[PDB]
Every structure is written in C-alpha cells, then in structure tokens.
DNA sequence: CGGGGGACAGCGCGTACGTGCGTTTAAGCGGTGCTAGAGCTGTCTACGACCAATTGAGCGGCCTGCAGACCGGGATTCTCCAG
DNA sequence: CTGGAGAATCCCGGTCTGCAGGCCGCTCAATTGGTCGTAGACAGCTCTAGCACCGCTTAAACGCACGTACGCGCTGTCCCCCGC
C-alpha cells in the first residue's frame, strides 16, 4: 500500500520518523521502544504551540505581524511556569522585563 | 535666564525606561573583540574567530551583567540605599555561589 | 551539505495557533535550540530512568516519567494528557 | 593585545546597570566590575578554547562556545543551538 | 496534623547556631517552617515519582538520592 | 511524621524504608544551615546581628529559588 | 547475591599513603559514591564530546579533555600525568 | 563643574529580644508481633532489531512584494518653577 | 495649589528594502514488508523489613520572669555623583 507517515497516523506536525532516528542515534539506550517516539513528538509539539500562542499573543501586544525575539522573552519570562522551565536559559536578543524598584520612585 | 536642569534622578529613570524596553547591545563591538582576543592570546597563539562566537560571548557577558547588576540593586536596597557599592557586588557573587 | 531543522513544523504549528502570524529568522533559530535543549533533556532523562530499572528499551511510559521530573505542573499534566491521547490516537489506527 | 580590559567604557558600564535597573551608582565599582568580567571570560574562553583544540582545530567556532556556556550552567539559545 | 509545628523552636535555634547565627527574630520560626515545607515538597514529589515509575509502594534511599541529584543537591553516604 | 504526612498529597498508603527518611532529614539539614548562613551574612550586610525574614527572603531571592 | 564496590582498591591507597590509618564504614561509602560520581560525570563529558566531533570510539585523548575541562586547574594537570605516565607504562608493558 | 541630595555619624529609646528556673511532655528505647511487599525465578511471547525495495517529504536554490525600518515634522506629555 | 516654559516623547504620513515566504527539482531518509531472536511480562515463590503496639525514662521543650542592648527613628554634615 501508498506510504502513510507515522505522524498522520498519530494526526501530529511532528516528524516522528526523524524523533526515532535520533533517538537510535543519541546513544541513550540499547532499543527503542515503539510509542517512545510518538509521545516526545507530541510533547514537543504541544509545548511549541504554548509558547508560539504566547508569543503572538505580545507580538500582536506590541502591533507587529512577525514575532521577534524579544516577544520571545516577553513571553516566557511573563508566563510563570514557563520562566521556571527556562530558569537558566539566556535568549540572544532577548531584552529585560521592564521592572523598577518601588524606592526608587520620584515622592 | 536660566539653564533649567533637571532634579538629580529623573534622568536616571528615564534612562532606566530606555534601556528596559530596548534589546540591543550596550558595549561598543571593537574594544569587546580586542579584550576576548587578548585573554585568550595567553591559552592558544594565533587562534582564528569565527565573529559569531565574537558577539554570541557579547551576548552572554552582557547578559550574565545585567543579572549581576538586578541582584547588587538589590542588595543595596536592603541597605536601605540607593547607591551599589562594591561590597553589595561582593556579597551577591558570594551568595550566588560564585564566591 | 545539507542540515535538517524544525523549521517547517514550527511555521505549521505557528499557522495553526496564530494563522497570520510572521516570524523572522532568529526568533525562529530560537525555537529550534529550545527543542532540541528539551528534547536533550527528556532523553537524557528518560535513559538514566532505563539504566536505574535495568532495562533494555525506552518506552512510552518512561518519556511520560521524565515528562513529569522535568515539567512544572500544569505544563506537566497538559504536556502528559497531550501525549497520552497521542498515542492512544497512533495505535488505534 | 595589552590594556582592552580599559576599552570597557564607564559609559557602558552604566548603561549595563541601567538596563539593570540601577539608579545610583558609585566610582568605585566600575574596576570591580571589570574584574569580575574578565573572570568570568576567562572561565567561558578557556572551555572554548579546549573543545576547539580538541577538534584538532586553529579558528574557535560559535558552536563551541555555546557548549562552554552550556557546560557552566549559562545555556545560550539562537546561536546555532 | 501539625506536624509542621513538630519542629520546636529549639530545634530552629540550634540549625542557626550550627549555621553560625547570634541573635534570632521572633517571627524567623514560621519562615523556616515554610520553607522546609517547600523544599520538603519538591524532594518528595520526584522522590515518588521514582517509586511509582518502580511499580513499588515503598520508597527507597536510593530513589532520594536520585531526586537530589536531578535537583543539583548531590548526597553522599547512601550508595 | 511530617515527611509522612507530606507524603499524602501524591500517593496514599506509601511505605518508606528508615534509610530514605535519614537521606531527607541529612538533606534538609543541611540545606537550612547553608540557608541560614546565607542569611547571617545578608543580615549583617545590613548592618545588624538579629535575622528577620526578609533576609532569608532576599537570600532565597538571590540564591534563584524564589 | 554480591554487589561490587570500591572498598578493596581504596583500602589498599590508603595503606599506600597512610599504612597505620584505619577507616569507618561510613567514610569507604562515602568514598565509593565520591568515586562513582566521578565516574560519571568524566565519562557522560567524554561520550557528549565524542558526539560532538562525530565518532564512534572514545580513546584516552577524550579522556584527558574531560578532565582538563572538569577539573581545576593544579589538579588537572597532575592527574593529565598521572593518566599519561600509565598510558605510557602500559602501553610499553 | 556646581551643587543638591544621598551617605553617614551620632544620640535617644523601649522593647523584643536573650538568660535562667520550674514544669510538662513526648522523644527515644527496648520489646513483641504481624505481613505486605520487596526480591528472586522460570517461561514464553510478543516486540523490536535488521534488511531489501520504494518513494515523496524535506532540503537546497531562486525570487519577490511587502513588514518594518527610517525619515521629518507637528502633537502631545512630563517636569520644574514662580507665584 | 497652578499656569507657563522648556524639554522630551508620540505619532502619523512618506519612502525604501532586505527577507519571509513561497515555488521547484531532486534524493535520501522514511516507509513497507517480512524474519528472528530475546526482554520482559507474567505468574509464582520466599522472607525482610516496615509498620504497628506498648511501657519506661528522662532529656527537651515549654512557660515565664526579667532586664538590657539594639533596631529604629531622628538630626545634622559634608562630599561626591549627577546633569550638563
């Protein structure tokens, strides 16, 4: 029969192919079981879309159509559960959350 | 008749507010370059670049500063001050776990 | 040569949240390091999980493991109820 | 090569506490953070340097650096990744 | 139920002496119970998830050696 | 009796060997006395010798857990 | 059955070192986790740089960089020869 | 380089600490007793590795119109002060 | 309180342009289909340790009296960092 990709079968953009070939490749273990591969590409997948809707979502904040990365790290570091999922990571391009302290207010 | 100058401090906040909306970088690139050049000079001569370790090095310096810098405020505001100094920087590297 | 990305299924995924949404190149070389530090970390993950339980393969059920170590909560439940229904989805058909 | 660690302007060191959300400022502590800078190059150039050596190489790559910064905690994202 | 009043103030006074503390505020104590609590949370949830991935019902040493190493709090001493 | 207590929340009826409990208390411990110190010096930066919870919150603050 | 350790190895370095010292258990448990972190973290920093130059043998040489890049300074050095004055007395043995 | 305003030194205070004694309690210890579950074993079966043939998805190269950047100049706002 | 004044910023047309995004040919990695060996699923067994209980014993916490030093508020000085 016609060829039918592994991610339709599972309905996914992912490429659960490419995920299982580099998986064999990492080294992280002997064998690979069958669902594996399937289930990180729909981690994977869905953790994009989070982070993508949050982007847009400051992109279209700021007015602009093309998301750039300092909508990248307004996004991440305003959303709290992803700020701790990237706790150490440092985005090229990224800019600060703009915050001051309250002491140094003009009163 | 009279320069209008403006009270100590909101230059500063308004200099602030510039600088937290803006991404780009803050360090002039040729200086940046001849310092990393020459702190590795003393590991490996005649060492080639490729610029994009050249500014992505600028990026995480500047980064790593400004996180620096976001904890020493800090420090001194719990120093019920205004002004960082040195010993707010060193008490926060210590703490960090740099020290 | 060649080098190979996830380019394409990051624009897919960004046409089917926000459908008319631009992306520049950088933000874009962004996305791919963070899949590929997240798919680093799951995977390493999941192998230490295989090593400690003297097993041969990585299944499913360790990725949903390391899925769990690795998220913060409602990202975790979410990302697990994601890949749960993905596989019940692959299998059936 | 001798004396750049001076090319670190004052005037970028304020606009890096700016950015910080800095207002004051004292003179004592732009050397202070000059000196912290250069260790912490010197920490990050030396890993590069090793791991482009060890690829038997004579140009340091951008790739390399990123697996410094990885291996020191700091992960760098858009730089090849 | 209140276990977490199980930490007398006395056990609190010597963790600081130990730590090099001379003079202690009142309401130290309470912020000390809660941060515990905190941490207390996050080594046992992954501890757990170690044992169920297991299938087992007891929870071993060596599962909380695991989840402080996974949270950059390496312990010796246990294997 | 607390860590046991704290072990309800995520599964019932959980069995502990004595050896895990030992590893959690050695853990804490030693944790909370890094905690205090840290707090010690912060509070001394304040130029005091009594420690108040916000030191303890700025130390965590700094230390990255906060 | 029998678990294996480090104990007889360590024993006999200390009797190297200290001929008169004896030791708890407590400390040779605490001597063998040290030594298996050790372990570890060498040969997970020797397995990602061999996948970083695109090879399929790990040799000594990935060794010796590992452990320039794990250990500080005086104490890379001597352990750089200690690993190469054994090579080398192998090698010739 | 002028100057304001922030750092800092000094003083008063009152109270929240530390110190010590009498009291109550529950931790700890030794002992007994029970079994659930950890740990180990034999089996076999389903499942994953592996290979040959197939092919179209994705990667490379090309091209473009428009998002966004960059002007310029009024409009509007924020701050500082003399009243 | 409160207008002016000046400086700073916003904004809105108008202009230009690099790249985001789409199109295309191809090719190599994914797919399909079949083989085979073996990992672990599973049932079954043993007995260890974890849980529970109880009775002493006594160290440890607790409550409390009490008193003092320190954290804090306030004030004046001057110098040094900022606006230019």
């Given at each position: 029969?016609?060829?039918?990709?592994?991610?339709?079968?599972?309905?996914?953009?992912?490429?659960?192919?490419?995920?299982?070939?580099?998986?064999?490749?990492?080294?992280?273990?002997?064998?690979?079981?069958a669902?594996?591969?399937?289930y990180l590409?729909?981690?994977?997948?869905?953790?994009?879309?989070?982070?993508?809707?949050?982007?847009?979502?400051?992109?279209?904040?700021?007015?602009?159509?093309?998301?750039?990365?300092?909508?990248?790290?307004?996004?991440?570091?305003?959303?709290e559960?992803?700020?701790?999922?990237?706790?150490?990571?440092?985005?090229?391009?990224?800019?600060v959350?703009?915050?001051?302290?309250?002491?140094?207010?003009?009163? | 008749?009279?320069?209008?100058?403006?009270?100590?401090?909101?230059?500063?906040?308004?200099?602030?507010?510039?600088?937290?909306?803006?991404?780009?970088?803050?360090?002039?690139?040729?200086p940046?370059?001849?310092?990393?050049?020459?702190?590795?000079?003393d590991?490996?001569?005649?060492?080639?670049?490729?610029?994009?370790?050249v500014?992505?090095?600028?990026?995480?310096?500047?980064?790593?500063?400004?996180?620096?810098?976001?904890?020493?405020?800090?420090?001194?505001?719990?120093?019920?001050?205004?002004?960082?100094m040195?010993?707010?920087?060193?008490?926060?590297?210590?703490?960090?776990?740099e020290? | 040569?060649?080098?190979?990305?996830?380019?394409?299924?990051?624009?897919?995924?960004?046409?089917?949240?926000?459908?008319?949404?631009?992306?520049?190149?950088?933000?874009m070389?962004?996305?791919?390091?963070?899949?590929?530090?997240?798919?680093?970390?799951?995977?390493?993950?999941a192998?230490?999980?295989?090593?400690?339980?003297?097993?041969?393969?990585?299944?499913?059920?360790?990725?949903?493991?390391?899925?769990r170590?690795?998220?913060?909560?409602?990202?975790?439940?979410?990302?697990?109820?994601?890949?749960?229904?993905?596989?019940?989805?692959?299998?059936?058909? | 090569?001798?004396?750049?660690?001076?090319?670190?302007?004052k005037?970028?060191?304020?606009?890096?506490?700016?950015?910080?959300?800095?207002?004051?400022?004292?003179?004592?502590i732009?050397?202070?953070?000059?000196?912290?800078?250069?260790?912490?190059?010197?920490?990050?150039?030396?890993?590069?340097?090793?791991?482009?050596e060890?690829?038997?190489?004579?140009?340091?790559?951008?790739?390399?650096?990123?697996?410094?910064?990885?291996?020191?905690?700091?992960?760098?994202?858009?730089?090849?990744?």
């Open positions: 029969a016609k060829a039918k990709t592994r991610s339709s079968r599972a309905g996914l953009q992912f490429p659960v192919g490419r995920v299982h070939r580099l998986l064999r490749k990492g080294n992280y273990a002997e064998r690979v079981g669902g594996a591969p399937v590409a729909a981690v994977l997948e869905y953790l994009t879309a989070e982070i993508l809707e949050l982007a847009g979502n400051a992109a279209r904040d700021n007015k602009k159509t093309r998301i750039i990365p300092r909508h990248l790290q307004l996004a991440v570091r305003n959303d559960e992803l700020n701790k999922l990237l706790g150490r990571v440092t985005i090229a391009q990224g800019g959350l703009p915050n001051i302290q309250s002491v140094l207010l003009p009163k | 008749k009279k320069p209008h100058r403006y009270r100590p401090g909101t230059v500063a906040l308004r200099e602030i507010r510039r600088y937290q909306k803006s991404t780009e970088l803050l360090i002039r690139k040729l940046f370059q001849r310092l990393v050049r020459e702190i590795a000079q590991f490996k001569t005649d060492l080639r670049f490729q610029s994009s370790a500014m992505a090095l600028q990026e995480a310096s500047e980064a790593y500063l400004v996180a620096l810098f976001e904890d020493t405020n800090l420090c001194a505001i719990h120093a019920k001050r205004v002004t960082i040195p010993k707010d920087i060193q008490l926060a590297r210590r703490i960090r776990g020290r | 040569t060649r080098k190979e990305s996830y380019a394409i299924y990051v624009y897919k995924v960004l046409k089917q949240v926000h459908p008319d949404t631009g992306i520049s190149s950088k933000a070389s962004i996305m791919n390091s963070f899949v590929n530090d997240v798919f680093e970390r799951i995977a390493g993950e192998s230490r999980l295989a090593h400690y339980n003297k097993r041969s393969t990585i299944t499913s059920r360790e990725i949903q493991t390391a899925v170590l690795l998220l913060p909560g409602e990202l975790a439940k979410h990302a697990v109820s994601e890949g749960t229904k993905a596989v019940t989805k692959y299998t059936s058909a | 090569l001798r004396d750049n660690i001076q090319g670190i302007t005037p970028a060191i304020r606009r890096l506490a700016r950015r910080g959300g800095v207002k004051r400022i004292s003179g004592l732009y050397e202070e953070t000059r000196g912290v800078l250069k260790v912490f190059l010197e920490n990050v150039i030396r890993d590069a340097v090793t791991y482009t060890h690829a038997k190489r004579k140009t340091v790559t951008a790739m390399d650096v990123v697996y410094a910064l990885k291996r020191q905690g700091r992960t760098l994202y858009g730089f090849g990744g």
